[PDB]
Amino acid sequence: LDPAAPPEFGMKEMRESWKVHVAPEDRPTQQMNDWDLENLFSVTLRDAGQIALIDGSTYEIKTVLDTGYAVHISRLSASGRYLFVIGRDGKVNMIDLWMKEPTTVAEIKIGSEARSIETSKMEGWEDKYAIAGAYWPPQYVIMDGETLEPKKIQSTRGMTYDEQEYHPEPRVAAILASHYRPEFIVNVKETGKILLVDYTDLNNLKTTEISAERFLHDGGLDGSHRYFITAANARNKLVVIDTKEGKLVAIEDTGGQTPHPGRGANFVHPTFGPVWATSHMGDDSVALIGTDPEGHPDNAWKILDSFPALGGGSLFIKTHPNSQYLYVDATLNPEAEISGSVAVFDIKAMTGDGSDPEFKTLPIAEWAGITEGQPRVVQGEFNKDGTEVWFSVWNGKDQESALVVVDDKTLELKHVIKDERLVTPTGKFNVYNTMTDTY
Amino acid sequence: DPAAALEDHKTRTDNRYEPSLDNLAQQDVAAPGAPEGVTALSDAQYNEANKIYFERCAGCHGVLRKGATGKALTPDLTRDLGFDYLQSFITYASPAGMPNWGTSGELSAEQVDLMANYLLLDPAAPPEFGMKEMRESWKVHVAPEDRPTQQMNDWDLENLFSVTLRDAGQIALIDGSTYEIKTVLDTGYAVHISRLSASGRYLFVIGRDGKVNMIDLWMKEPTTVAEIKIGSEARSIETSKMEGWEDKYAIAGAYWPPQYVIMDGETLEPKKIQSTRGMTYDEQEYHPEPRVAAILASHYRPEFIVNVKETGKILLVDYTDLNNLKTTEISAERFLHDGGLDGSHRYFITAANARNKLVVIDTKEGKLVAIEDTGGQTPHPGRGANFVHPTFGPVWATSHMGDDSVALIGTDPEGHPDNAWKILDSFPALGGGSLFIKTHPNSQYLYVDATLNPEAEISGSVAVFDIKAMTGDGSDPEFKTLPIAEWAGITEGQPRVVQGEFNKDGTEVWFSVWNGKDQESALVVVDDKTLELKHVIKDERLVTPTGKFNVYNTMTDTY
Ligand code: DHE
Ligand code: DHE
Ligand code: HEM
């Protein structure tokens, strides 16, 4: 039978869902609670349709807030004051961390299926805007950073970059924010276009539509925050965009199957210099790409090394400037023992001689002490000081889950977080590292 | 109440101006399945109804029936209305289309039923037309390397006129001084407009069917050197006019699919296709059929200026990099159609016709500068008419389809600040149904036609205002009436006079005496200095002459 196109979701629909619980004039003018906001972690309690705000040093759950169902990610405004979360269903909640009791100050629905949201990060534009992307309808929406008022909706339906054929369903994938220009960086999956959207004028809207590679998914900025490196996953490529000049710089095959970097991991390789790393969903490989055209021209935008980690099914790779370690999970691996563990490479020991660097295997799920099921360990996230790294031990909604905190210096267990309210923990986002894009 | 069709569907002068998608209508379609509660149409019946729909209803209601000037007619809506309502409503007929080729708006009893039944069935979206399709249609008849390196014919190219012989799908190249038809070229289907490359060497024509032809005027015998199809229905084309980018690119706009395409200015190779489907500027709701209307070229930046109708967006597309594509999507006003640049070539002034607004864009800064109501009904400027009003200073003028008014808007923000982007004067011309207003820097006269006027006396004449006599004292300036059709001496039918166009020197202005395809038409040349008849062009080959474009005035945007 002929398929019936699902309903659209425009301004009228968004505005009807738009609710401002606490108007800006009624919010505080300074932090009114005594929490260490920058060291706070926003944790997704997936199936419960909630998030937990957890103290990064005491591990105390400061509060559990109701949100949209299965929040995909948490993102922070550039000032670190406002917390934005978006559920699979397209529901966005804006939380004021300055309130005596932080809660949702405004909410809005931006589509039927959505996975991304981000805040304005250009100097001078702090707290000005938020942007959300949807799978359905194929669109992104720029909202007021203070009230969530929907200001500009842009359809992503359009032509594929290569064969230049119309595609009626180009889903918006990752959305990042430029630190070089007042622009949002939007990945459009099926058409293989990366959009640089200038938010200085939403009426006379300037955008740069960059032809990249199809199946764009996730990615991150390099250490200098100038270049966006993203995975065109189904095609095993990493695309590099210069956000300063607003143009494609390179497209390179990682040599692995289905790279899935998350925002990736930037570090200074002892021999190669500045690099960005990604693991893969399709195999056990970890690939490094040079990210320094000025200082290391010969290595810039070239895959410098590829080596195995725990196994396939990896989703997130992580490191921090203060750490000498590179953490790699294997969340989707069919083998319980593997999906419940993390590989850790010693960056200092890397020579880049072509051999496979050794890694230590952390039995994260074992450390959490969970009997039932075969819980999957996922996504490392560092605290503000970059001295501890957290991992979610993801089990079923009616099963026991946990968060495992690892001491980065020793690679030993630091703390196991368990609470009856900790249902299906997945994404974890430290306020400071998220607001500053430190990865 | 179906009786509402009396007003809703009444023929009016400004509503005869709706696109007829007769090219897309030629496409054969399979009949869809009929859901519970609705009777199915056979493949033959559905095809017949589909052709009628595209030819006389899709212009106002949309190919996809999502609505344009007329509301949406999707199955979810029509099924609630019911067959009886639809049958009764459609029985009263629909608005007539353009004269000399458009529909009468009358349907037989069987056709009314076919339409009512058709509206209850789920509309199938017509085919897309992407790169593969374009490249399959792309033909380079004479490679650039094999073309002349200098003009090989002895024609005064800059004084040449490219004239649309509409129904025949041909164009006539006519000498501007001798009035000799130098050649008549075939393209297949009706050409809508002719545009010139910035150098004046290449002549581009766009057919209503999406066919683009590029003609080399330097050839001993000018002919199409390259061709390509860019869609199913199209009405606009333009060339790169930024200094330094002469002959680099050409761009074509389409009604269906909703998209524009940038092509190589030498070979027509399709380089970049952009969909115009998107959100309306004001209510910000997705629109699946935003038609591309007029397209102009910036003289301040290497950009094309693209009007997107249903969404009310004006696009400034930077052609310096087609891979890392820079565009400025300007929220303007819905129903953008035609327009032109002011005398300084810096500001784009365009009519959002259905809303009686003129939208002004600063092409240097790339931003909207003003939106002003003309005070008239349905402005249709063509590219408009720029002149230095004796008291108001630089102004741009437009006439209207819905009434007899001529409106002037100040176009000098620096030199005449108070008058800038304000309607400085409004006065009557011959009558309603006007389509084109015209002047030239070397002329002291402003010409205004009345093509669609229901009165023969008026539709066959032109009003001429003496710019030097304008006082801007609030009173209505007088005008002389030139009996253009009468001067052409045509008996049969009711020929309609349309579009003035000057020669290179601005000493003579031409008008088309547009009659039916099986009737006699003519081109009338008026001596600008005396406002007297100069010459009448008549030829058996001159079938349905409409648009005329002088090479010099088109390549330089002199209007
Ligand atoms: C587009 C996209 C982003 C980037 C967001 C941004 O830039 O703000 C993203 C990031 C993420 C991030 C970001 C982490 C970071 O450090 O930036 C996390 C934690 C995450 C948890 C999951 N993701 Fe994600 N995810 C998808 C989409 C996306 N995920 C999918 O389409 C997919 C493959 C399947 C689906 O139906 O959702 C998928 C499965 C998952 C999971 O299985 C996870 C582990 C749990 C869940 O609820 O689905 N996704
Ligand atoms: C989008 C558009 C432009 C701008 C072109 C550009 O910027 O390159 C334009 C310009 C034009 C211009 C430009 C004049 C100028 O000086 O720039 C002319 C002569 C013209 C003669 C006609 N046009 Fe036109 N015209 C349409 C569309 C357009 N017309 C329609 O949709 C409509 C209403 C119905 C249709 O189905 O085509 C229509 C009917 C007509 C006619 O009936 C005319 C009078 C005769 C003909 O040849 O079809 N159109
Ligand atoms: C072509 C023969 C044609 C059809 C078919 C058609 C149908 C149609 C219907 C059934 C309605 C009533 C819908 C309702 O009451 O909800 C309707 C209404 C309007 N139409 Fe129409 N219409 C056809 C042709 C045209 C043409 C050529 C125009 C544009 C000049 C046009 C316009 C309108 C208008 C206006 C209305 C009233 C509602 C509104 O949109 O304001 N139609 N039409």
Side-chain angles (χ1 to χ4, degrees), chain A residues 1-170 172-439, chain B:
Chain A
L1 299 180
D2 299 296
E8 290 294 326
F9 200 90
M11 191 58 78
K12 187 168 66 59
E13 293 67 39
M14 292 188 197
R15 286 189 174 268
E16 291 181 315
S17 77
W18 180 39
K19 301 179 193 62
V20 179
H21 304 315
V22 185
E25 323 83 63
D26 297 325
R27 306 178 189 159
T29 46
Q30 64 183 105
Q31 185 179 344
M32 302 193 141
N33 59 60
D34 70 355
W35 308 3
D36 181 344
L37 299 186
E38 290 181 357
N39 200 36
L40 202 65
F41 279 71
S42 179
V43 184
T44 297
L45 304 187
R46 199 189 180 282
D47 297 26
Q50 298 176 318
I51 58 164
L53 297 183
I54 309 184
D55 187 301
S57 54
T58 67
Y59 316 116
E60 296 170 84
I61 294 171
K62 306 298 282 172
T63 175
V64 174
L65 302 171
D66 291 317
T67 60
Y69 184 81
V71 160
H72 216 74
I73 53 137
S74 287
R75 287 289 180 267
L76 278 291
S77 67
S79 69
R81 176 179 178 172
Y82 295 113
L83 170 59
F84 294 85
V85 294
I86 187 166
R88 306 178 69 67
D89 63 339
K91 179 53 62 73
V92 175
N93 277 244
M94 178 185 170
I95 295 156
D96 184 358
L97 297 176
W98 279 13
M99 290 176 75
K100 184 163 292 166
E101 304 173 58
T103 190
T104 296
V105 293
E107 59 175 85
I108 191 175
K109 187 172 168 54
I110 60 89
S112 308
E113 285 287 331
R115 302 292 183 278
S116 58
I117 187 163
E118 183 59 301
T119 59
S120 46
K121 290 170 169 170
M122 177 63 206
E123 187 167 315
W125 295 86
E126 302 85 2
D127 284 303
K128 216 63 54 169
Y129 296 109
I131 181 174
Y135 276 4
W136 189 272
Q139 64 192 25
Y140 66 82
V141 186
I142 293 175
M143 308 162 280
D144 186 278
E146 296 240 297
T147 63
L148 280 192
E149 182 179 4
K151 306 298 285 183
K152 199 70 187 300
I153 306 170
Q154 298 283 300
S155 168
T156 53
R157 288 173 165 110
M159 313 303 280
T160 56
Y161 91 95
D162 50 2
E163 298 175 33
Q164 292 196 64
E165 303 292 324
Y166 178 70
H167 199 298
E169 199 172 332
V172 171
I175 297 180
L176 279 72
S178 181
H179 292 229
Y180 276 72
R181 303 195 297 192
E183 296 173 334
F184 281 124
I185 304 164
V186 182
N187 271 349
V188 187
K189 186 180 297 295
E190 287 77 5
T191 51
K193 304 285 186 60
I194 299 176
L195 319 181
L196 297 180
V197 185
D198 183 307
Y199 50 72
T200 65
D201 191 335
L202 304 180
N203 300 133
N204 304 292
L205 190 80
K206 286 195 178 297
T207 70
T208 299
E209 180 185 301
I210 302 173
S211 290
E213 179 63 281
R214 295 190 190 182
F215 305 112
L216 294 171
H217 192 67
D218 48 355
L221 296 173
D222 73 301
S224 66
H225 289 123
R226 177 175 168 171
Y227 302 92
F228 175 50
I229 305 168
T230 181
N233 66 21
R235 293 189 176 180
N236 304 335
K237 306 291 189 291
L238 287 180
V239 173
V240 184
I241 302 303
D242 182 346
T243 70
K244 185 182 174 177
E245 298 306 313
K247 51 182 45 49
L248 177 69
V249 171
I251 298 182
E252 298 292 325
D253 193 283
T254 67
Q257 296 301 131
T258 320
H260 188 275
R263 283 164 291 150
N266 291 291
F267 65 96
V268 182
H269 188 284
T271 61
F272 299 138
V275 298
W276 175 97
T278 182
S279 54
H280 299 71
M281 280 176 55
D283 65 32
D284 66 9
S285 71
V286 170
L288 314 183
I289 187 169
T291 63
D292 183 20
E294 281 284 317
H296 296 77
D298 297 351
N299 291 345
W301 318 125
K302 288 177 175 167
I303 305 297
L304 308 169
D305 206 356
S306 177
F307 48 85
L310 272 181
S314 182
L315 293 178
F316 303 101
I317 188 160
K318 204 75 186 186
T319 195
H320 184 276
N322 294 335
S323 172
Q324 78 180 91
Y325 298 115
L326 189 62
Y327 300 82
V328 190
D329 60 33
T331 316
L332 308 176
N333 196 278
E335 197 181 320
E337 192 184 330
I338 292 187
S339 56
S341 300
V342 169
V344 188
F345 298 87
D346 184 348
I347 291 168
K348 285 186 163 177
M350 297 181 171
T351 58
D353 64 0
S355 63
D356 295 333
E358 298 184 314
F359 61 83
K360 180 175 167 182
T361 303
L362 309 189
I364 303 301
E366 182 181 307
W367 286 351
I370 299 176
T371 310
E372 70 197 308
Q374 289 70 34
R376 297 177 178 282
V377 174
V378 66
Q379 192 223 14
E381 174 65 356
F382 282 81
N383 57 358
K384 169 180 170 178
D385 296 342
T387 54
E388 298 182 353
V389 57
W390 298 29
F391 289 99
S392 292
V393 184
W394 183 19
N395 224 356
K397 179 178 178 180
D398 299 313
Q399 300 178 297
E400 186 182 24
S401 288
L403 299 189
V404 168
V405 181
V406 183
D407 176 40
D408 178 77
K409 303 297 177 185
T410 62
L411 294 184
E412 294 177 4
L413 176 57
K414 176 68 213 298
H415 188 78
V416 175
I417 293 171
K418 279 184 179 183
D419 190 292
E420 287 303 296
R421 300 169 294 173
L422 192 84
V423 177
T424 54
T426 49
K428 302 161 301 295
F429 302 91
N430 170 258
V431 172
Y432 190 84
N433 294 342
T434 306
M435 69 184 261
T436 61
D437 292 341
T438 298
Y439 49 76
Chain B
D1 190 15
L6 288 206
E7 308 300 307
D8 302 355
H9 277 190
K10 171 193 277 178
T11 299
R12 300 177 210 250
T13 309
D14 57 359
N15 74 4
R16 286 183 86 155
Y17 194 86
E18 289 295 343
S20 170
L21 311 176
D22 49 70
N23 305 291
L24 183 67
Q26 294 186 109
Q27 290 185 19
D28 216 73
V29 298
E36 183 183 316
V38 300
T39 302
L41 287 177
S42 67
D43 286 275
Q45 291 177 304
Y46 187 81
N47 261 295
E48 184 180 345
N50 189 65
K51 176 172 171 169
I52 297 169
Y53 186 74
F54 287 168
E55 291 183 333
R56 58 180 90 179
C57 323
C60 298
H61 293 289
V63 165
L64 307 175
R65 313 222 297 270
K66 301 285 173 49
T69 48
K71 63 178 299 293
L73 295 179
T74 47
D76 52 281
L77 303 172
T78 60
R79 288 172 189 156
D80 289 348
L81 288 176
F83 178 83
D84 291 358
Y85 176 84
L86 299 175
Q87 182 187 46
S88 297
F89 192 96
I90 297 168
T91 296
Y92 292 99
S94 55
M98 291 298 269
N100 293 323
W101 67 265
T103 182
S104 56
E106 302 174 303
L107 292 172
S108 66
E110 181 183 0
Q111 288 172 330
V112 168
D113 284 356
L114 286 183
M115 299 314 297
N117 281 307
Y118 173 92
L119 294 183
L120 294 166
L121 301 168
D122 290 281
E128 288 297 323
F129 204 88
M131 190 59 81
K132 181 176 74 59
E133 292 67 39
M134 290 183 197
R135 288 188 172 269
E136 292 182 314
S137 77
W138 180 40
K139 311 179 186 63
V140 175
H141 304 295
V142 186
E145 31 170 346
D146 303 323
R147 303 176 189 164
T149 51
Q150 66 186 100
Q151 188 182 335
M152 300 196 158
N153 60 60
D154 69 350
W155 306 5
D156 180 348
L157 298 178
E158 296 188 340
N159 204 37
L160 192 73
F161 281 67
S162 181
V163 182
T164 296
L165 301 188
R166 195 189 182 289
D167 297 26
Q170 298 158 347
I171 56 163
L173 300 185
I174 313 181
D175 190 292
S177 47
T178 66
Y179 316 116
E180 180 185 29
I181 292 173
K182 304 294 277 175
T183 176
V184 177
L185 300 179
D186 283 76
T187 65
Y189 277 71
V191 164
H192 209 67
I193 54 129
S194 290
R195 286 291 179 263
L196 278 295
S197 68
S199 64
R201 178 183 178 170
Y202 294 112
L203 169 61
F204 292 83
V205 294
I206 182 117
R208 298 171 78 265
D209 66 335
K211 179 59 62 64
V212 176
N213 276 264
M214 175 188 182
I215 296 157
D216 183 359
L217 297 174
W218 281 10
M219 295 175 72
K220 196 164 293 171
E221 184 179 313
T223 189
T224 298
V225 292
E227 70 178 83
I228 195 175
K229 185 173 171 59
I230 57 83
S232 301
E233 290 282 344
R235 303 293 185 275
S236 60
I237 186 166
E238 185 55 301
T239 60
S240 49
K241 293 173 174 171
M242 175 63 215
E243 184 183 315
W245 293 86
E246 297 85 0
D247 286 310
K248 299 298 170 194
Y249 295 111
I251 180 177
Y255 280 181
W256 190 273
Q259 61 191 28
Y260 64 83
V261 194
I262 294 173
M263 306 159 278
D264 184 279
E266 296 284 9
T267 64
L268 287 194
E269 183 182 5
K271 306 299 277 187
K272 196 72 175 197
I273 304 167
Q274 293 287 303
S275 164
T276 46
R277 286 153 160 130
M279 312 300 283
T280 55
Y281 92 92
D282 52 355
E283 295 176 35
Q284 298 200 59
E285 118 179 89
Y286 179 73
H287 198 295
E289 200 180 325
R291 302 173 176 154
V292 176
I295 296 177
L296 281 72
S298 178
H299 292 252
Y300 275 70
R301 299 194 139 288
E303 295 177 335
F304 283 127
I305 302 169
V306 185
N307 269 350
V308 185
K309 188 177 302 294
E310 288 80 1
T311 49
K313 305 293 184 61
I314 294 175
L315 313 179
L316 295 183
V317 191
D318 185 313
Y319 50 73
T320 64
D321 190 334
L322 306 178
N323 295 146
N324 305 291
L325 192 73
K326 281 214 175 205
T327 66
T328 301
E329 176 189 302
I330 299 171
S331 291
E333 179 63 275
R334 293 167 77 155
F335 303 116
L336 292 165
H337 192 58
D338 48 351
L341 300 174
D342 72 300
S344 70
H345 288 167
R346 174 171 173 174
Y347 304 92
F348 174 49
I349 311 170
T350 182
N353 66 22
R355 294 179 178 192
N356 308 330
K357 305 297 191 285
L358 287 178
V359 177
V360 185
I361 303 308
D362 181 343
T363 70
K364 184 183 179 182
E365 298 308 318
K367 296 177 185 296
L368 173 72
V369 159
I371 297 184
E372 295 295 323
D373 197 281
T374 67
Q377 292 299 137
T378 322
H380 187 280
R383 285 165 293 150
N386 294 293
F387 63 93
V388 179
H389 185 284
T391 69
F392 294 138
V395 296
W396 176 95
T398 180
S399 51
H400 300 73
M401 290 188 40
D403 66 32
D404 67 6
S405 70
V406 170
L408 307 184
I409 187 170
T411 65
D412 187 12
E414 289 187 348
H416 290 76
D418 265 351
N419 293 350
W421 320 127
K422 288 176 175 169
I423 304 303
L424 305 176
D425 200 10
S426 177
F427 47 91
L430 281 181
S434 183
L435 292 180
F436 301 98
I437 190 162
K438 204 75 186 188
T439 195
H440 185 276
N442 295 338
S443 173
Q444 73 183 81
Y445 298 120
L446 186 65
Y447 301 79
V448 188
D449 63 29
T451 317
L452 308 180
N453 196 280
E455 172 61 57
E457 266 203 79
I458 298 176
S459 61
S461 300
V462 166
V464 188
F465 295 91
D466 184 350
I467 295 167
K468 282 180 170 178
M470 293 180 184
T471 60
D473 61 356
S475 67
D476 296 337
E478 298 183 303
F479 59 85
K480 178 176 170 181
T481 299
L482 307 185
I484 305 297
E486 181 184 316
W487 280 350
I490 299 176
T491 60
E492 65 187 310
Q494 176 189 331
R496 300 173 179 274
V497 176
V498 67
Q499 191 220 19
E501 174 71 348
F502 286 80
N503 59 356
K504 177 174 161 186
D505 289 338
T507 55
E508 297 177 357
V509 55
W510 300 28
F511 290 97
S512 291
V513 178
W514 179 30
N515 219 353
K517 69 175 300 193
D518 293 309
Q519 303 184 292
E520 189 185 35
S521 292
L523 301 186
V524 173
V525 184
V526 181
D527 177 2
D528 180 75
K529 182 180 173 176
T530 60
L531 296 185
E532 292 173 2
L533 174 61
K534 175 83 205 310
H535 179 80
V536 179
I537 300 175
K538 276 177 156 181
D539 192 294
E540 182 269 352
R541 295 170 296 174
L542 196 82
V543 179
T544 57
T546 54
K548 300 160 303 294
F549 304 94
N550 170 254
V551 171
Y552 191 82
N553 296 338
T554 306
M555 73 177 249
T556 61
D557 293 343
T558 295
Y559 47 77

